[PDB]
Design a protein around this nucleic acid. Structure first.
Lengths: 135, 363, 50
RNA sequence: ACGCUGCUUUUUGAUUCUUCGAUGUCGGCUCUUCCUAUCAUCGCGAAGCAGAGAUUGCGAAGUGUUGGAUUGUUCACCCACCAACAGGGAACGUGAGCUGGGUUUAGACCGUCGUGAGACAGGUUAGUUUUACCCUACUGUGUGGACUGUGCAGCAGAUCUUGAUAGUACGAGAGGAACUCUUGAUUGCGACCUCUGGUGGAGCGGCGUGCCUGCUGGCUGCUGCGGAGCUACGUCGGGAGUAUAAUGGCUGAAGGCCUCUAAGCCUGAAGACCGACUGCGCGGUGUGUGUGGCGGAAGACGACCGCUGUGUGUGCAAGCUGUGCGGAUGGAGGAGGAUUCCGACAUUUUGAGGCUGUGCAUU
RNA sequence: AAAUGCCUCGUCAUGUAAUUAGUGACGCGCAUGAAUGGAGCAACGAGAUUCCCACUGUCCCUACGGCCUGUCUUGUGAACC
RNA sequence: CGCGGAAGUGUUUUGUGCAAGGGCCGUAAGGGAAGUCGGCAAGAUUGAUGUGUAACUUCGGGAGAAGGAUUGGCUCUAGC
RNA sequence: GACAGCCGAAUUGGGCGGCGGAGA
RNA sequence: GUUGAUUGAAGGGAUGCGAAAGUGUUCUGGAGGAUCUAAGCCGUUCUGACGUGCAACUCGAUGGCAUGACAUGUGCAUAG
């Protein structure tokens, strides 16, 4: 069954296919690579690209030998490209990071390291309850 | 032959051919539909573009919907609109070939800025008024007035030569339209008597000029790869062998900008006068409507102005035509404005109100 | 309306003009311009800038 | 099933009518247009259609139909996304548009064949891509006022999604919808510079190499910040008009019954026409243009928008850089009778000096 | 299955999210094989191949700037067809 | 050598100010070969002095292997 | 006293020759 | 005609180990169709410029070689 994704205002996208991201939960993985984005419909020659909140299709480049050589799902939580909010302010984070997910939407780990944007926290409430800081 | 990988075409054929405009004051293409169960009013106005600024706004949702109140920052445009003068009447009757215009009624004294527009800068080298009023009343399916601007009140344009136009009069009873405009000849009508806050509006003008431009910029086509001989900024194939001619739908190099455009559904935010303090905001300071240093490449605003949301066609100091909406409008969300930015637009201004700068440095 | 105070120069920032940068510890520092983010990257001490 | 009748011109053959005093021969990349034998989106039938999900048929060509790994490939085959990832024509569209991987004369290696010179639609590696300033086509531009009418031509938005409806109708259960309202986006088109980002041989600073005898001040090199203007990675903006197709209905004969049809009538589509929006010719009217000069919001040159002496210079305002020369008080230490000299740099006078094309005033 | 294997993108393993490529192993080998030289890579190579790190306007998707041309003037003043 | 200077030698004094498109160059957010037959082109490393250096090997080599660190100006001390 | 569903006059099965419509 | 550097073979000195046979360390010396760089000479790539050209083979950047099986003026010998 398809995963529902709540509404979100327009943001500049920072992640593309071939970017290497860091894993932020204690599931066993270290480094992920983006191979696809969900909801991408296309345009001739344009690469699919994502912003925080989006779901990505990843491959595990470094981690436990159990997780390797397969295809997974992940949620994006931080990016280094600047984006604008609708009250007029701008914000950026220090790295690119994502977190692993089931086929129904549940987190695979139990802890999450680092801060999280306020946008990501209302789309995904179960990530809100495990974040050490919101903005 | 059959072409794998389809994509949309680059640019629109609605606006080909892309020639310069033949005039700086284009005339409106249509007018709204007359409802003769209202009082008599006008349907348009002419103003001048000054510059852009900020505003912060409270999105009224304070019901216990999950977002009570948001803040929203919006860009706006300011236009300077001195009052206009009426100096004539015009009627049109209906024939088998369409609208035929009847002889015109001039007032008593035509200004010196209306005579420079009609006969050039070197122009200085009765009951028949009453008979023509009877025709516009027996005949004359529709009625229009002749109005002119007063550019000498904005001394940063340097005109002395006025812009003139015809504007339709709406409101019922053709004999009532005429007698309302007979008691208005040679007098002024102000922009606060035409438009009101939170209404949708149309604009008509001419765009910023760019001259002769290449095809990567005029239409948005791809660049060629880096190894390519004979340049990379171009289209590679301009047609098939047959038909053995170039088609009107191929992209070519030529004039870009200075076109006539009509834009619709621009929302009005404020109506005031430049020689007083802008308020209705929820902060205390005085703050006239003009930033520290002035509007760049424009002076100050000292007459009436109007503020609308978003971008507006054209360049600074150029004339624009404002028209009432032709569509159906629902309501308009409730508008609550609580701050208007007036820092310097030259550089990165960090003060409002130069007295605030004076108290930071001391001396 | 003020957005906040610059964490390098001490000056007031107008509404809509800064960039917040969040660090890995959850600390969000606010700076005004690229003149200031460069002095932080080079590791200059603000007390040596008059 | 066994048999039988057709259409297209996308395959490969069959033929040799045109071209050997030469029509540049495969694929890709780029760009435009057409066909319908419709893949998705809109409307509507049938069922071995309970609901959900699909299967089969009709009207319909307006708009869409992607990103990668391996191969020169067309083709093929897998991965990921998707509303869906349909099939074709235009000299097997497109080399004075490109590229040159396939093919590819002259060098060379291997296998098989030949006494040999050499051969192979067998494999491998290295191997020049010339010329428009002519006619036409097409894009702008020019072809001598002001306000408007009305004919012709062009034509634009499309698609997905959140919450509610509702755990409801339907179903033994498991499962599980719709109209109406509502939230956001993706992509196309047309604008704009308030904000954020990029650039900035304008301007100010730092650190050097050579040269002017040294200090001060210059010229030359590298580097930080960087206003105006331009720009996107930034911001803004879409008819409830008329008549119809397939289908479903009303009245009603032929044919005392029956029947949506033979006369008439009602309804009905991302389609047609019209409107709105942009361009051009032709008309009308109490209406006919500043020679020259100087500016710009305009511009290759012509043109267009303005004024008819209101410029230049200077002052203030608003910004960018970052604390000027000279003096005074210090300085790791060294030199030696004078209580002297040498010394990178520091603090102070000093948000200080320099600079500005933007705005206001005055001369 | 090698610059030598027609069938052929041979079969199994390994590197990738995905391998007509690369490497390892197998052998009735159309048509491998011993100075027609066979096996074999220390050192050397502007030789032919595949992968990793680093790095970037190659690309997503283009923008802004410099100098010389072109655009405009005077002089000298051809050719192909 | 490169990057700058002498000596000797050569040289003019009423064309414009810079549209598109070219030839030779400079700077770029976030991503980092997804481009392409093919990393073609560009970017990147670079002097000197301590440190630390593997498989293999014809014992000579491989080797500047790889990998890490230091560097200006001023005022002095020590050796010959 | 037919055909059609007491009514009062025509009803109907096969073929042929021209014409029109699907297949298109 | 041929600049400035890098590497460090044989031969020779000193010093340590050991019953002996032998062997460790380090200076001196300056070999080799050994490694760069200059005067210079060639011609890998851009399939760069140019392509009625500056030119009937040139120009820019990049790259290769530079004590030799070298480069070059002039007398003599070899002819379809």
């Amino acid at each position: 069954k398809k995963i529902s994704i709540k509404p979100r205002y327009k943001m500049t996208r920072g992640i593309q296919v071939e970017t290497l991201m860091k894993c932020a939960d204690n599931s066993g993985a270290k480094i992920l690579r983006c191979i696809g984005v969900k909801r991408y419909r296309g345009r001739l020659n344009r690469l699919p690209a994502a912003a925080p909140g989006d779901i990505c299709v990843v491959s595990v480049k470094k981690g436990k030998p159990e997780l390797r050589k397969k295809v997974h799902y992940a949620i994006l939580i931080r990016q280094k490209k600047i984006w604008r909010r609708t009250d007029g302010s701008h914000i950026m984070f220090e790295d690119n990071a994502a977190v692993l997910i089931n086929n129904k939407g549940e987190l695979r780990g139990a802890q999450i390291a680092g801060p999280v944007p306020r946008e990501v926290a209302d789309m995904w409430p179960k990530i809100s309850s495990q974040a050490s800081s919101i903005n | 032959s059959c072409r794998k990988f389809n994509a949309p075409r680059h640019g629109s054929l609605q606006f080909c051919p892309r020639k310069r405009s033949k005039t700086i004051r284009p005339a409106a293409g249509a007018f709204p539909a007359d409802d003769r169960s209202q009082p008599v009013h006008l349907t348009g106005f002419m103003a001048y573009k000054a510059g852009m600024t900020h505003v912060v706004r409270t999105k009224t949702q304070v019901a216990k919907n999950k977002q009570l109140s948001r803040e929203i920052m919006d860009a706006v445009t300011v236009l300077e609109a001195p009052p206009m003068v009426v100096y004539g009447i015009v009627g049109y009757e209906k024939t088998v070939t369409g609208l035929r215009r009847l002889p015109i009624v001039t007032a008593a004294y035509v200004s010196d800025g209306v005579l420079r527009r009609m006969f050039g800068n070197r122009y200085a080298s009765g009951s028949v008024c009453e008979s023509r009023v009877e025709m516009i009343k027996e005949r004359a399916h529709c009625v229009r007035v002749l109005v002119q601007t007063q550019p000498t009140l904005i001394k940063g344009l340097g005109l002395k030569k006025a812009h003139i136009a015809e504007i339709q009069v709406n409101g019922g009873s053709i004999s009532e339209k005429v007698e309302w405009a007979l008691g208005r000849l040679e007098k002024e009508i102000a922009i606060g008597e035409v438009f009101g806050v939170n209404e949708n509006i149309d604009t008509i003008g001419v765009t910023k000029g760019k001259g002769f431009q290449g095809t990567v910029k005029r239409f948005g086509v791809r660049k060629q790869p880096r190894k390519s001989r004979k340049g990379i900024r171009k289209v590679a194939c301009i047609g098939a062998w047959h038909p053995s001619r170039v088609m009107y739908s191929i992209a070519r190099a030529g004039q870009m900008g200075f076109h006539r455009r009509t834009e619709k559904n621009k929302r009005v935010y404020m109506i005031g006068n430049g020689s007083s303090n802008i308020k209705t905001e929820f902060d205390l300071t005085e703050k006239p409507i003009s930033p520290m240093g002035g509007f760049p490449h424009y002076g100050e605003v000292r007459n009436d102005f109007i503020m609308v949301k978003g971008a507006v066609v054209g360049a600074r100091k150029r004339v624009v035509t404002l028209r009432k909406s032709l569509l159906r409008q629902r309501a308009g969300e409730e508008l609550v404005i609580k701050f208007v930015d007036t820092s310097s637009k030259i550089g990165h201004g960090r003060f409002q109100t130069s007295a605030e700068k004076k108290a930071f440095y001391g001396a | 309306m003020i957005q906040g105070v610059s964490m390098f120069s001490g000056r007031n920032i107008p509404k809509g003009s800064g960039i917040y940068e969040v660090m890995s510890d959850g600390r969000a520092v606010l700076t005004a311009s690229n003149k200031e983010r460069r002095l932080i990257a080079r590791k200059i001490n603000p007390r040596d800038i008059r």
